[PDB]
Write a protein that binds this DNA or RNA. Sequence first.
RNA 1: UUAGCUAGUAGGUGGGGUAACGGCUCACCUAGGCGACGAUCCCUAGCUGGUCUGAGAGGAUGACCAGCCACACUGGAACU
RNA 2: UACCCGCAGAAGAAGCACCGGCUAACUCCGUGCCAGCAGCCGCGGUAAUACGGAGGGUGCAAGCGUUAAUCGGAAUUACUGGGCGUAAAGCGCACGCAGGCGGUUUGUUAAGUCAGAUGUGAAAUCCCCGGGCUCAACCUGGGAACUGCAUCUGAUACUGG
Lengths: 205, 156, 80, 82, 129, 46, 123
Amino acid sequence: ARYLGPKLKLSRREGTDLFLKSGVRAIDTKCKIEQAPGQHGARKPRLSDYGVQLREKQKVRRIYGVLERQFRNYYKEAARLKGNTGENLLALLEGRLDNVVYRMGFGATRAEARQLVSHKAIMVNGRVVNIASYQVSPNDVVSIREKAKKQSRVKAALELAEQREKPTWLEVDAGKMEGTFKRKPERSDLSADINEHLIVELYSK
Amino acid sequence: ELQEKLIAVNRVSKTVKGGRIFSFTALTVVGDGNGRVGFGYGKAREVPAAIQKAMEKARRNMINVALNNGTLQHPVKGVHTGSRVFMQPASEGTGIIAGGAMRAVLEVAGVHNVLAKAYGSTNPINVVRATIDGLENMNSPEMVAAKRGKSVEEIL
Amino acid sequence: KIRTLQGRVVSDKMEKSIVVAIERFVKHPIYGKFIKRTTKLHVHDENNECGIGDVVEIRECRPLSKTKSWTLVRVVEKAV
Amino acid sequence: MVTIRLARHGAKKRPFYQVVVADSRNARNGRFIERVGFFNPIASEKEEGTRLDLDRIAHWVGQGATISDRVAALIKEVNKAA
Amino acid sequence: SMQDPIADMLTRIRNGQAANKAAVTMPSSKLKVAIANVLKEEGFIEDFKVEGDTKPELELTLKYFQGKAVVESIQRVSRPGLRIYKRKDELPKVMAGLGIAVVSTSKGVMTDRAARQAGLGGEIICYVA
Amino acid sequence: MSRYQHTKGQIKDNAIEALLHDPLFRQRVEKNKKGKGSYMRKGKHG
Amino acid sequence: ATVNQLVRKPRARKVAKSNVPALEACPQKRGVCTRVYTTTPKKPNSALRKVCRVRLTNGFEVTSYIGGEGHNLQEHSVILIRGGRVKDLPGVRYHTVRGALDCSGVKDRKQARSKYGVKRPKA
RNA sequence: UUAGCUAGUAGGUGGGGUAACGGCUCACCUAGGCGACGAUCCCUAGCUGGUCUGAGAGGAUGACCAGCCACACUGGAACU
RNA sequence: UACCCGCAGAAGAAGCACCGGCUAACUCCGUGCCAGCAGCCGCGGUAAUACGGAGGGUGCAAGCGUUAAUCGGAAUUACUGGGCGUAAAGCGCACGCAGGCGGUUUGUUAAGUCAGAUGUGAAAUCCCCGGGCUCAACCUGGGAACUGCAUCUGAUACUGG
Ligand SMILES: [Mg+2]
Ligand SMILES: [Mg+2]
Ligand SMILES: [Mg+2]
Ligand SMILES: [Mg+2]
Ligand SMILES: [Mg+2]
Ligand SMILES: [Mg+2]
Ligand SMILES: [Mg+2]
Ligand SMILES: [Mg+2]
Ligand SMILES: [Mg+2]
Ligand SMILES: [Mg+2]
Ligand SMILES: [Mg+2]
Ligand SMILES: [Mg+2]
Ligand SMILES: [Mg+2]
Ligand SMILES: [Mg+2]
Ligand SMILES: [Mg+2]
Ligand SMILES: [Mg+2]
């Protein structure tokens, strides 16, 4: 259910930084981010119309760490729901418990957050939730349980988050180790580099 | 400000006493991402020169299209040669649902939300022309009000 | 008030009995065309009052024979 | 005869009982005249487990319908609650 | 033989629009007249004029805006070979509400929008864009 | 190994000769890369 | 084209037969090799294509291609055929399944093994 | 590239029979009845709610679940 | 039993297809119209990104491929939604029964048509707002829908009588 291989490779393939590593060390020092992975990295072939969309889709999938069938399901759900489809999909992706945790700053990477979720560290409304794909609702408090509160990794993650830009749609407490999912995030709150529309188009043929 | 992209480049032949002389035909389309749309069809012995020619052609002979909030105003048919085209406006978030050359021309135009289909022949040059024709013919509410001698609120 | 149908008498040869074609104006399920369809029915008539090509109002009843579950109520336009 | 009885309509180890008026000979989950409410034995706190359209049940009884024991118990419970 | 007068009228109108003719004339009918009136109301023609007693002739003054024809497209929907009847909820929208659909309703010949407002359907005579 | 099913039916006199007059030992003519029958509509990788 | 005409006599749908008729809507069928032989393909291809005439479970007598480099097949060899026509070979509409029934997997393959019935090289 | 089919056949009168109407059956009388809006014959097929696909209209389909039908080694027959 | 707590240690747990174009992903060696590949086009005859191996990559993932099967694309039976001078397609020409269609005015009828209502259109399924299994799948409350048919009361512009 997870990708287990090299993480920076994926980023290289994409072109952009996907936040796949914590960010203590800069991405440019740790890998050749501009060069594609493999023997034929130096060559940059001209990509087809289908191709670019596919790449974009992969980028988004990589970002969240979501496998294809689940992604398809998410897309379908977005389509079903009223309003903007790509936007809806993005919102759904955000809703993911692990992603929420990452945003809050309990996980240094999203992978770390996912791990935490798996290992029973995370409580949603005073209930220990184990699934990363759990859709967090508005006005839902999500906290670290007292067993996992003594973890040094968690504090490091928090510190890292403090350095990074904080989300408007969340309110997080460092000392209490709890966060409030205020509202489902808007498109303007999220990154502009993501071209959701291409992804939408892709799943229409 | 002007976004420009090549649709299709094809090698064409002229036959002579010696053998065949090969030329390249490049079909490009330009748009400002608002109302203006223009296609270009350039031809040279080399590809890049041909593409340049096409671009030049596209830059002149442009056509203004009435767009409502980044989409079409009404369902519209467009015809040229064998290529008979249909395109329909859609709710925001649906994306550009169009095939081949069509997709390109819509993107440069600045439409973001369409459901479109090409019937009959699907020859790139013809189909793009058809699409452009369709775009041209499509009128706005204001325009129709002007034509009928009425207000926009009376027609809705 | 009673359920009843109208039609032309196609044949009146058999004793106490008439066959009455009923023209129904149905729409086609696929094509949308309105087509004249025919419903042939074996009708009971006492006294043998009916002629050929006669318009007749008929009602459904308990079956009187193998094919005959309909009886006439009134005869209209008995022109020859 | 006409009877008022439960039809098990749930998941494995999670039953949900649809109270139905039916001809007794019919299969439990099969043909029925009228569905006159529901009962959920696995229902949590802060939700209605049992809800029965009592008037219809009464009508059926009047007509001459037998009541299943469990259904009767449910009815009694409802009466107590009200 | 002439089997559809309304259709013929529409064709005539179309031809006039094409050929830049100021006025189009035809043998008058009641339904035709109603249609003309509807068009006038909607503003696709300038004026309509019935003239004659024994055999009256409807004369339509065509409308042109900025050198070009006002009536862009004009197509019959119901026809003698294939009749078309729609319900109030089933009523179509020409040019996404911009163009009009002439509908013969229980309460007289009117535009589609008017029919919708009323709350009744009927025979859709033609689409006009 | 597998037997070749020749299109000669029942060989009577000489087998080798029969085989020679069969699709098996047909002439193999190269398609020109340059010259006469040399024109390719689309390349191997185009 | 006229609606009345259509009403009178409706549009006949294109009755399309299957190109694999001896399989009889079955994914695979078992058969016995009546003979195994090589054949020359049609122009412009030059080869000696391995193929077998098969008396099938359901009474049909067909010919089926043998994919891969080298095979153990011979007369009276109980094999599974899967369908898929060979463009070069005249009258060949079927592929034998490598790694099923009497048919062996291809020797020394490390890629696309699924298609050729080759087991994982354990190391 | 199945055009004619049908004598209990179509109808009537009277008896008999059915829980019940009825050629359901019998006696006699009439000569009908169905059929190009496809009778008859031949090939295939359980039917539906539905399922799959599709923008839709349609096309294909009828496992599971539910309703209806038919069958219970094959062909008949009745009794309770 | 679900569920919860404790114990130890990264521990017991990743493959399958593909990489000529369509179609995301390229090179080297081996072979030399041979062996072989292939859905189509076609590839291979000594520098093969198309065969086989390797390295590298791409796509899926406890699955991944192949085959069969249906719909889709395929407006390629076109009701929506195609055509017929020359691409497939106007009977050799006429008359004409059945059939289809039918100028205009008034009246009437209310069959077609439209409107409203009543009864039904089983439940499940599909869809919407919810609730319950840690999430989901799944189960489920209420709705909507089931485009239909029948009956009653009206409307009468159009089609019919
Ligand atoms: Mg949506
Ligand atoms: Mg010269
Ligand atoms: Mg209890
Ligand atoms: Mg059978
Ligand atoms: Mg379609
Ligand atoms: Mg047995
Ligand atoms: Mg590629
Ligand atoms: Mg080599
Ligand atoms: Mg390939
Ligand atoms: Mg290879
Ligand atoms: Mg089709
Ligand atoms: Mg055609
Ligand atoms: Mg011809
Ligand atoms: Mg002629
Ligand atoms: Mg008339
Ligand atoms: Mg009249």
